[PDB]
Symmetry: none
Subunit: 191 residues, 4 copies
């Protein structure tokens, strides 16, 4: 049970990468047997009241105090089956290089988000990008597009890509933008 101590120290070290990717509300269905119903609802309420990142921070607070045998592997499995293969792979090997290399394109898309909202319609490329987002994120993007309009939906799409753990989502996005012939492709340089 020194492995656990080493596992706890590393999570705190990499909490800034984790909270930038993980929306814990998406992996609570795979971890419900490890958390109290009250803890599940507190994490869910924190997401609705403050956002994904603070919800992830609270989820880690609970995660770092668990003691049952195998709590860490349960987290890895929950991440994987929810769709966080990239984040799961990074945590399992404590190597965030593939996620660090994405920082440049996280900064670029966030800086260019106004042009993104002005020139991209999520209804045109969401299917091509469904391998870079959690299935529920794609569902929320379509509902927002259907209730609030194109610009509102495009912003949700941009925010979801920024938190994607797929090492090549910038290239996936470039290909989708070119297939639809979008003014934004001229602003998106991958290779």
């Amino acid at each position: 049970a020194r492995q656990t101590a080493e596992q706890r120290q590393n999570l705190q070290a990499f909490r800034d990468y984790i909270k930038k990717i993980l929306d814990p509300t998406y992996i609570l269905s795979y971890m419900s047997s490890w958390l109290e119903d009250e803890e599940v609802q507190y994490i869910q309420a924190e997401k609705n009241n403050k956002g994904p990142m603070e919800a992830a921070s609270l989820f880690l607070q609970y995660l770092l105090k668990l003691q049952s045998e195998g709590w860490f592997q349960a987290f890895l499995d929950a991440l994987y089956h929810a769709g966080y293969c990239g984040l799961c792979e990074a945590i399992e090997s404590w190597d965030f290089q593939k996620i660090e290399k994405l920082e440049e394109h996280r900064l670029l898309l966030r800086r260019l988000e106004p042009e993104f909202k002005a020139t991209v319609d999520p209804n045109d490329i969401l299917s091509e990008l469904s391998e870079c987002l959690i299935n529920q994120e794609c569902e929320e993007i379509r509902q927002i597009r259907d209730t609030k309009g194109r610009m509102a939906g495009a912003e949700k799409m941009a925010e979801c890509l920024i938190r994607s753990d797929k090492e090549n989502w910038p290239k996936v996005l470039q290909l989708a933008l070119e297939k639809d012939n979008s003014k934004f492709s001229e602003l998106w340089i991958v290779d």
Copy 2:
């Protein structure tokens, strides 16, 4: 509501505290809370629901309820539960018999564990109408709002969480029947 009757009413509430806090959202009996509780205590209970969730709000509501002394607080509580829709929970408290609510535990755990498969194969728009009498009236309304603002998986998860907290003795069977009408991949996983 003498001294020997409050003690029995208090003893009964604590005896079933885990059954109550797993079913009751005190936000739904707010007209009872405001006429029997201090206004400040009501707002703390409301803050607890918004900030922590229904279960923590129910736990806090019970703390206040167990300290009341006013005449008729217990029977008023039962009356509130019934008119809110908590017929099963109200019927259980009056007769100290939670057998019908205990038989549901088997299906509460099953749906909780199978929640990923539920969200993946079920659309509340297909079964919400069939399941209305198993949920509180406000729960049906929030399920549709979530379904329309966040999508199918989000609405399905809220529905599953509301079924888990249902006190209707036969909601597992009603759910199975609705699932069969649509011929859904989840029916093979839901045995009653």
Copy 3:
């Protein structure tokens, strides 16, 4: 004086009101009595939780007002929005006509699946318009025209269940019979 008495009756009957009233339909009449934040909080509650939770929040605010004439503004707003039945009940504090509808609220709740399968709102919406708020009829038509018959049929069923019109069950029977629909055989009043 009468404010204090009117305040006490609202709390007594709040649960009947929030079963009928969607405050989103009377906020255009009441914005001068509520802070802008309170108006928008009620609107967000409607979008996030539904009419009933929005009505509960509106009543909490309404029960703390003190300005002169807030109650009379509420009655008039109910009328101009279309809540004639609910307005008539509040003026006399007699909810017998709305209580008597509970039997048919439960029946239409039971039969909503059969309703969605056999009823087209485009056929009876006009006959039932005086049982619904005008804005509800518009949303039923938008749903019917964008999402299909069942979606509009479900929206209609949910709106009738919340109707304060004392004779909407009989109006529904007659309209369904006028069109000769398979659901009329299950709807007898």
Copy 4:
């Protein structure tokens, strides 16, 4: 310089009530996401969804008044302008809200007439004539509501956006559009 920061904070605090009646911060967050913490950005978005624009703007100002990085104020002005808040930008930049105060009379009149507006105006008829007075994303949300919930729902959303418009002449543009459509509401809206 700290002097300019200090003076800019006092003036923002001085006008916080004019700002929070016009500014929906969700519309200028894409231009300022680089100046706020990810947590602060998402909390502002949750506040909009949970409480509305005014509470979101009030929360946004609390964060704005604690910034210290070089150029945060000019970034705020740039975000406002390019989002479409030219009038509010002109008012904040020059500390003159005369044009926005002069609108108070017509904000009150339209709000009072909101029932008559919803009953006689269809956004499909005047939205194009009025798009100059509204944020581009507001026009998209008006059409989505108009197309999913109907005319009265869209008409009320339209009035709410006009009420928060920072264009000094939106009352006159509305009158002209209502006359072009020959609308029952024109008899109630002059000047």
